[PDB]
Amino acid sequence: PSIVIASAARTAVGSFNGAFANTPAHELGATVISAVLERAGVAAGEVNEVILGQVLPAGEGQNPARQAAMKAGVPQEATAWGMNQLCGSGLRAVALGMQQIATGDASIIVAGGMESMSMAPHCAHLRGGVKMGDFKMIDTMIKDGLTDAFYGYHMGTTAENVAKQWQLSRDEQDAFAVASYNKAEAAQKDGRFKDEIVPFIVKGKGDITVDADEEIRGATLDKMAKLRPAFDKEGTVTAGNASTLNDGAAAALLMSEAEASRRGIQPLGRIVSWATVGVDPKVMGTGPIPASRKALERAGWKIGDLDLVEANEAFAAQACAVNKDLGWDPSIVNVNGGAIAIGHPIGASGARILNTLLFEMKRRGARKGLATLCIGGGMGVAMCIESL
Amino acid sequence: PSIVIASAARTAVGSFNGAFANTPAHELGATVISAVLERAGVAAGEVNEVILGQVLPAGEGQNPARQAAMKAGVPQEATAWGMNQLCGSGLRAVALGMQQIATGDASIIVAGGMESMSMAPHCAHLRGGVKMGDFKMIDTMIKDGLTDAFYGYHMGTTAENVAKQWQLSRDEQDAFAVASYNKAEAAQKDGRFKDEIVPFIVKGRKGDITVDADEEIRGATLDKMAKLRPAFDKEGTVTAGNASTLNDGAAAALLMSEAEASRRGIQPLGRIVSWATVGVDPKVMGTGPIPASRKALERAGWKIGDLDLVEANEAFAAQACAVNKDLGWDPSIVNVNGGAIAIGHPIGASGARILNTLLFEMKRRGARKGLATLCIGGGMGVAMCIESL
Amino acid sequence: PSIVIASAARTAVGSFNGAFANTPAHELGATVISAVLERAGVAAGEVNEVILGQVLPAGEGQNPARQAAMKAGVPQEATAWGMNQLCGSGLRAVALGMQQIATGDASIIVAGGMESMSMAPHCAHLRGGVKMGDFKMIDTMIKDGLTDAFYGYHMGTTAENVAKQWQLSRDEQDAFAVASYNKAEAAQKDGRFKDEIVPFIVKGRKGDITVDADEEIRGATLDKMAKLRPAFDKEGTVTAGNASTLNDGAAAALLMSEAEASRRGIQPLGRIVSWATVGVDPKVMGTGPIPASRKALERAGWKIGDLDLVEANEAFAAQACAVNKDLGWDPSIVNVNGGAIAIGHPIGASGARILNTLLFEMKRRGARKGLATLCIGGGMGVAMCIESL
Amino acid sequence: PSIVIASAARTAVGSFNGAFANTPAHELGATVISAVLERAGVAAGEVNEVILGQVLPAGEGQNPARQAAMKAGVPQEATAWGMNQLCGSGLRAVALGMQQIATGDASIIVAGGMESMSMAPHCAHLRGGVKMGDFKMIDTMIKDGLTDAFYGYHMGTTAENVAKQWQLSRDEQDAFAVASYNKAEAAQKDGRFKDEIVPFIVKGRKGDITVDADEEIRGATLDKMAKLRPAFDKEGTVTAGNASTLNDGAAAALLMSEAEASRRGIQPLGRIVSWATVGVDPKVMGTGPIPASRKALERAGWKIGDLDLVEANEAFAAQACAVNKDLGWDPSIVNVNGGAIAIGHPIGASGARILNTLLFEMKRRGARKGLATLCIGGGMGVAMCIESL
């Protein structure tokens, strides 16, 4: 069969300890699950399963995907579960949900991701007991999200390795970062994010409506060039040319093409292929290169056939290398900005860029699109979408 | 296409703060991944993906499934990811791996689960800062594993609801518990667990220790069982004796198509013929296996009377009694080697663990049609039907 | 023998998590110890011992009094130690230093107190290990400073007990609080605190800051006081406005014999003529100053009518009203420059703090006989009688 | 102005995380306060003040000295407070109580120390908030007890500095340690500790346990001593065998004037003749007892040859060897029953502990002149001279 994405939605990407500083991830997920149902004309009672990628669920309780679905009104007869492939969790959950319908084990899937890096706690193993001496409380965000398990250094150090192997200077990375901020600021002023964003009510001394990405700001090349390196003491990656820590959620609604036709739904696009490949963890930023090539081969497309591309900009150094290797037209890649300016909610980033890719394809009439991300531990994932 | 299970393996189920008290889950997972490869004659370089269910990964680092796969020798070109559907993660990961091969996106999958509840840390959100007063360090095992998010009480309280709704007395629950211990001790003495268990070497500073047997299997008496106080409700029926324990362990299986296994001369353990997952009310999450098993049997085209062997995970004695009563299958074919009440319940790996016991017991006695099923916290159930080859 | 106070000094009393939010207590103590030596013309090599009262020393390292004395330039030949009688630590340390000289075991003592309640950490006993369940991180400031060990409630609840037995309404407590703020606001503008305060340099990463004035002194109106919610009892009288605050600071004095001061040409601030410490019921700890002051006056041979100036620590508005009513001294001579309700309450240093205000104000107006007194948690009181020279 | 010690007592010195692993210090302190009152025939209502040295009071509540006195039956009218001069706190509290009676401010004092190093918690300053990254939970026992605030290394490193200045080999330190173990093993078998030790009832959920013997006394052999690796310096001399251990316990004495004991028919253990405290370089804090003992003897009018019994705290074998070498007193009269290397070193109570051993051993053999002394972290020493009656 053929699987389509009938609708999509996402929250505003909040800043670290910002708008969603005390909002649990499943509360953000419930808002997005409710949104994709209303935008497609599908009642919650018709959902079979909810697949939400999430990387930092410590302290959220039993199965936060189930909590988000129940809060969204999905009936108890349906099932829900989370999955963790780091930064590709949000996009991989869509591929997994697509397979549920392809094998005939489900009819309607809500797939996506959610992440609240502000709510990540500090932890320590204390069952054995500390007989003597000092011990460390571990930041679960750094440990389970931003630190390579094999080599021990931060993910930003991996971007420094890509910068050396591809010989990307500090000036070329700052130019990529400033260009990313300007494309995002222009898209926000023109309202190109209003379609995909669903407003979220932060209930507090009065409720607050969060409707815009609080990370999108105006950047200047001079202020960027003054920043000190954030990882290597004599390195190239800074806080300006690297993605930020963020909160948010995003999801999509999946069904077969015949099911959408019977319901009179005009889908956002049809999933034509997908792929996931592993690379060396030292250069995990090069993940999207073999993943995109494998997805295009599975779809039968050449790189020149793509009308629009959404590649997640974890770091300026990795994103420059991905565009250089694949050699696609940079004018069709992240036309509304990227994670360097909008933000990077790890569990939801895969579904976030998939939202931007779908609405921009319908807005400009693009026929063939591709979304791809790099994954910590040395992996990449990509998906090809054709418009309907 | 048709997907088969070419081989399977599991570690010994360790006790809480016992043999694996300081062994991370991925070290247990790597041992099982290496085992299913050796038992099938398949090199690690042929694995496409590793899907490991895990419920308590806090503090273990980035994607423990990837760590376990790399330590097992799986090449970096392959992919790996974890999934969390609580107690059914281990069995659901097999169902997900079967779909990768069914859709043609992979050829060889290693699927299973791993859990180290002893290594679960205590946590607290400290970014905002505590200006004054006391705060609580939260046990991640209790919070994210054994506590219902909607009603707030322990999973044992949900079993009390099943005991009340089904009118299961304390005596019927203790009789089920002792019967579970006796079936497990007999299977252990007869060596019916040696085929599925892969030995694990616990490397320590003062000499290494080989863990080869389930550390929870012991002799139980009805007299000592009847004296135990209720562990959740002050005037309830669920005790520490008739409830499953907290444990560590890992289990996995190797998946491939039937034609691929035929080309390699592999004699598979069984064929996955159907599977299903259904949700129920969280108040009575133990009743999950009832609609899940019925849906799996219909998808397989089997009647309940067609089943030759059944493995139903015994989260609680009260929950397991209700499942056998409703489904009405022959209790002599259900958990013939014991259950989680005596063997243990490592949440993330328990789904694949009972799938291991079901596969090896089917081959030794020549059973044709089998079924594995579990209950899932939050009100869900999962079941899988296997046919021998 | 006769013991005199040759000099005195104190830091500005900082707000909780304010100017000294990251300043250790011994750094505040070093500034005051060096100050009392420079104000008296005495080299550090002449100090015999340093006695610094401190209540919350957890996490500051080995013997913070020794650290404060060494950082102040006192040579290693001298000795230093801390003592803990809660809120009366600062004043009791002066009485102890007086006894060292009286018994002939020392010649020159630096005595006082220091407290940094902002730097108090959260703690938990973790050696035995938490096998399962949640536990609480204890605020050492609340536990070891502001919580009665026998009854378990906050010190503010003891003030509620004083309010009931003495029939103290909210209006009389707010009127005392507003009167305390106004006397402190008037004294600060007139510069009556400049002599006793030594400036403290808060060295920071983005420029240094000089702290020279008490940041807790604010303008209070009786209307704003009546709008405050009760802070302890849900239907009580003590609020955050009529109770002292949590603060950081240090204060000290320089002690020597009267003949020693004469040989060095020092004009002393005053002569210690008597002191006393008495215990009371912990339920009504606020009445501590009543029997302690009576015993000190009896030991000195003074009547209440002989006192020209009185400093009674205002831990709570309810406690200070009961002390003034029972002892019956002229309220116009009690805390003429305000009290802890407006200035602040650094627990370890509060005893020496009110001694600083009493000494400098006595010389400013030519008072002959003075008395300082405090209430102590756990049901104790301490008082000292001072005569001008 | 003559002060005598009417009675004394101490608990069994428990091992780190041993018998008193969950016993708070004030509970041990209460047992000793009750014992010295019955051993002297003094009612609790006659005690004026309780002075208890304590070094690690974090998490123990408001003023543990007051809690210990209240639990021992001392009335609320009495006063109590703690003091901290590290390892010399227990002995210094006796000197402070002696001064209260000498200055006429008290008649009957209970002085001593208490310490439960097992109950010391881990702490961290969390008020400002941890925005990102990991932080350290600090062990209050290591930080506030065993770490030099000026140089940052362990107290065992300071002993290495003393071993270097006196050129003390590993062989000479291990021989000194074994001699202390053997002298302690002989004293326990001969029952020379029963008079001073008061039994403590450890009330638990699973039966009460009576602790009446020091559990660290084991008896050592030089072969096992020479095989131990250095505990501080990678190529050092101090090992776990020749260094004192971490322990829990309490000890106290009862002070009064000589006319008071004669008026009550009390026969005192001994008369306090003099005391002294001196500071030294913190790098060589082990040399503390050398100027302190010489100063006390000079103040008492005694020559070193006059001492019939000497109790010098063996913080480390390297430190104790240098002290015996400098004063040159007869090694057969120094620590005749062993020392802290074998019995243990409870920081807050160690000063009063060696004072207990000295008083009872003086009576057992009829010694007339004794001396107790300890070294103090941060570069200090304290000593006291006792004359029998």
Ligand SMILES: CC(C)(COP(=O)(O)OP(=O)(O)OC[C@H]1O[C@@H](n2cnc3c(N)ncnc32)[C@H](O)[C@@H]1OP(=O)(O)O)[C@@H](O)C(=O)NCCC(=O)NCCS
């Ligand atoms: C890089 C990182 C460590 C930043 O930490 P940070 O120091 O707290 O960043 P901050 O913005 O809070 O502070 C950075 C400084 O640079 C400035 N700055 C940041 N972005 C800027 C910009 N875009 N333009 C100009 N100035 C900027 C900030 O204002 C601040 O100035 P300051 O020194 O005066 O406070 C963190 O965002 C990170 O780890 N990102 C990568 C996460 C990741 O790996 N994602 C992909 C997963 S594969």
Ligand SMILES: CC(C)(COP(=O)(O)OP(=O)(O)OC[C@H]1O[C@@H](n2cnc3c(N)ncnc32)[C@H](O)[C@@H]1OP(=O)(O)O)[C@@H](O)C(=O)NCCC(=O)NCCS
């Ligand atoms: C039930 C539970 C709370 C037990 O906690 P526990 O009290 O620490 O278990 P313990 O064995 O350490 O203590 C149990 C008591 O009963 C006794 N006991 C335990 N098992 C026994 C047995 N099988 N036979 C006889 N006596 C037994 C123990 O000796 C002990 O008594 P004691 O401490 O006085 O010697 C815990 O195992 C649990 O939470 N299980 C939940 C399982 C679950 O939720 N699974 C997922 C649901 S889908």
Ligand SMILES: CC(C)(COP(=O)(O)OP(=O)(O)OC[C@H]1O[C@@H](n2cnc3c(N)ncnc32)[C@H](O)[C@@H]1OP(=O)(O)O)[C@@H](O)C(=O)NCCC(=O)NCCS
């Ligand atoms: C009472 C106490 C709990 C208050 O601290 P707190 O809970 O953090 O409350 P705050 O001090 O922050 O101030 C509380 C409110 O009252 C208001 N307020 C406080 N004092 C005020 C005053 N003097 N005039 C007008 N308004 C005032 C504040 O603006 C604040 O308003 P908001 O919280 O609605 O924004 C604490 O200071 C305390 O325990 N003090 C007693 C300690 C003690 O026992 N000392 C004696 C030792 S025995």
Ligand SMILES: CC(C)(COP(=O)(O)OP(=O)(O)OC[C@H]1O[C@@H](n2cnc3c(N)ncnc32)[C@H](O)[C@@H]1OP(=O)(O)O)[C@@H](O)C(=O)NCCC(=O)NCCS
């Ligand atoms: C020295 C110190 C670090 C020891 O820490 P520790 O290693 O936990 O001590 P332990 O006894 O538990 O372990 C010591 C090792 O030496 C062995 N050992 C200890 N004492 C021994 C003895 N007397 N004879 C033979 N062997 C001995 C122990 O069995 C152990 O070896 P093991 O692990 O193989 O069984 C600690 O006691 C210390 O720091 N003391 C300092 C006290 C102090 O500073 N006082 C201040 C006075 S100013």
Ligand SMILES: [N+]
């Ligand atoms: N950025």
Ligand SMILES: [N+]
């Ligand atoms: N059990």
Ligand SMILES: [N+]
């Ligand atoms: N106040």
